[PDB]
Amino acid sequence: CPLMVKVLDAVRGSPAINVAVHVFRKAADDTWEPFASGKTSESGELHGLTTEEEFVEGIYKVEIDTKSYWKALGISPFHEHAEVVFTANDSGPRRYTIAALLSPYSYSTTAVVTNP
Amino acid sequence: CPLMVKVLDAVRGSPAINVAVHVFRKAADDTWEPFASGKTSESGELHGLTTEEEFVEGIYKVEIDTKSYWKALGISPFHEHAEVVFTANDSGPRRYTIAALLSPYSYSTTAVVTN
Amino acid sequence: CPLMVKVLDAVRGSPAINVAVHVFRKAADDTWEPFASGKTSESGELHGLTTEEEFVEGIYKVEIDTKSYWKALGISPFHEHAEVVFTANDSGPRRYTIAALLSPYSYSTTAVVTN
Amino acid sequence: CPLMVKVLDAVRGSPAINVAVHVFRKAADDTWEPFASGKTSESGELHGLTTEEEFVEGIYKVEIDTKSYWKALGISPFHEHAEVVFTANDSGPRRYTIAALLSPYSYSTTAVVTNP
Ligand SMILES: Cc1ccc(C(=O)c2ccc(O)c([N+](=O)[O-])c2)cc1
Ligand SMILES: Cc1ccc(C(=O)c2ccc(O)c([N+](=O)[O-])c2)cc1
């Protein structure tokens, strides 16, 4: 599994469960093509977005639907979503974990990149 | 000044100077229309982006060109840019500060919204 | 003003107002000696803690009383306080801003050190 | 394992390996008594600090030796250490993960608390 997303909730001190995530890849025409999507599990993790064969070099956007997450909890947050945009696999295949820590008016995101 | 952007560097413990910032406003057809832009000052701040008259309710995107910032320092970074997408709402307080704290493989962002 | 402390609230998107802040300086016997204290202003800032004459090189601790802040808002928080421990060094730039961004179960802190 | 520590490096986009961690517990005389210590593994994680029986209610301080970590890499950082101070187990036993994301002039820390 070459792309994993993990989301934490800084208000509750818990995994952020049921967070929708949409991944896009920049196409040759420079538009954002839908690539994969899913939701975080009870551990805050989202596995199985893609395969090593399909996850080719390119520019990818991971959109974490933070507003939908906070609104489903009956909280009015600031951001629409958190967007994480990066070039992947340009030095050969890597494994990427995109992590995010959410509050209603703030978030932080980090990447852990490993070479299998 | 209804919108200010502040950028900080977590590697050097300093303002992030001469960072390009582009602001867009979501149009009726869901595209992003250029709205305002500039470069951060020696204090890491970008003032003067817009006016109260122009900054109507709607969805805005602030794009911070972090990749060029790190490369100018001779550092290889992870992200293409940092993006902050939010709704401006007239019910809340009137002044928006979008702050970003940058590292090569991470960033955080907060909003400080005051009267 | 060689040392300033700024505190922000990530739940409400605001300065963290009336937060108690205590600064200590490490003594020769490794204990923490009271050095300066105050409460953050309506802007989330605490100015005036010390003077250039008094702020000599050494190890300092800034303790931010986050638990009382959250409880006054009716929120149950994780940490007893936030602590920032650092060395003041005359070789580096002269002005230190210690910034903290607070959530109930998390906080971040950065240093912005400038001339 | 009721207390785990995870540390990430925001400059390299990797686990922070070989980070020393010292845990203290406030004693009846209000001093900080040494409680447990260890170092992060190649995954950035530190397991096995304590046991459910020994990890009683109290106020605990987790000291993450960030300066020692950056200096071992030949980097001059700002902070001496990151200190995480919290009351544990006051509503019965819980499992705590203390996470930290490190940069030379900044860090963020979060807690994930679960009820077994
Ligand atoms: C159990 C666990 C806890 C924390 C993390 C983590 O990666 C993490 C910790 C603090 C953070 O501010 C961010 N972030 O996204 O910026 C990520 C990962 C796993
Ligand atoms: C108006 C203003 C807003 C933010 C900051 C700032 O320094 C800041 C911004 C984002 C952060 O995650 C942190 N932090 O403590 O980790 C600090 C400084 C000034």
Side-chain angles (χ1 to χ4, degrees), chain D:
Chain D
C1 188
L3 178 62
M4 190 267 273
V5 180
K6 183 153 187 176
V7 189
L8 292 313
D9 179 322
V11 169
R12 300 159 137 190
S14 65
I17 74 170
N18 294 323
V19 179
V21 177
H22 296 252
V23 186
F24 304 85
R25 183 182 177 281
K26 184 174 281 183
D29 56 21
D30 262 40
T31 64
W32 287 113
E33 186 76 8
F35 180 81
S37 69
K39 283 197 201 201
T40 61
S41 72
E42 299 184 351
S43 73
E45 298 184 4
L46 170 51
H47 295 275
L49 283 163
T50 188
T51 66
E52 193 194 344
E53 273 194 11
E54 286 181 338
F55 188 46
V56 294
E57 192 284 329
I59 300 174
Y60 291 83
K61 177 168 61 168
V62 175
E63 173 205 281
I64 302 174
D65 291 340
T66 58
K67 172 167 269 193
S68 294
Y69 169 78
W70 293 111
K71 285 186 69 183
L73 299 169
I75 296 305
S76 311
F78 186 74
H79 304 91
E80 293 300 305
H81 50 248
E83 289 189 356
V84 179
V85 183
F86 61 103
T87 300
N89 307 306
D90 205 28
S91 300
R94 300 291 186 275
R95 295 182 190 180
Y96 300 83
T97 298
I98 306 302
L101 176 62
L102 306 185
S103 298
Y105 281 72
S106 179
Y107 62 87
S108 57
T109 187
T110 194
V112 176
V113 184
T114 61
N115 188 346

Side-chain angles (χ1 to χ4, degrees), chain B residues 6 8 97 99 101 108, chain C residues 6 8 99-101 108-110, chain D residues 106:
Chain B
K6 183 161 197 177
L8 298 169
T97 296
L101 176 62
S108 63
Chain C
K6 183 161 197 177
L8 298 169
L101 176 62
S108 63
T109 189
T110 196
Chain D
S106 179

Side-chain angles (χ1 to χ4, degrees), chain C residues 19-83:
Chain C
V19 179
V21 176
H22 294 256
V23 187
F24 305 84
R25 186 174 181 272
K26 201 164 182 183
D29 69 0
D30 283 341
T31 63
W32 289 112
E33 181 193 48
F35 183 78
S37 62
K39 296 273 234 157
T40 59
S41 73
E42 292 284 328
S43 76
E45 295 173 11
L46 178 51
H47 298 265
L49 280 164
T50 188
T51 67
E52 320 166 341
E53 208 161 79
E54 168 176 74
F55 194 56
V56 301
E57 291 186 299
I59 297 176
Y60 294 84
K61 172 170 65 165
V62 177
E63 186 168 76
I64 304 172
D65 298 335
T66 59
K67 187 178 190 183
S68 299
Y69 176 74
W70 292 116
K71 283 210 253 141
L73 294 170
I75 293 169
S76 187
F78 178 71
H79 299 96
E80 286 297 299
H81 52 251
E83 303 213 83

Side-chain angles (χ1 to χ4, degrees), chain A residues 29-53:
Chain A
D29 56 21
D30 262 40
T31 64
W32 287 113
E33 186 76 8
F35 180 81
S37 69
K39 283 197 201 201
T40 61
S41 72
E42 299 184 351
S43 73
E45 298 184 4
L46 170 51
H47 295 275
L49 283 163
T50 188
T51 66
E52 193 194 344
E53 273 194 11

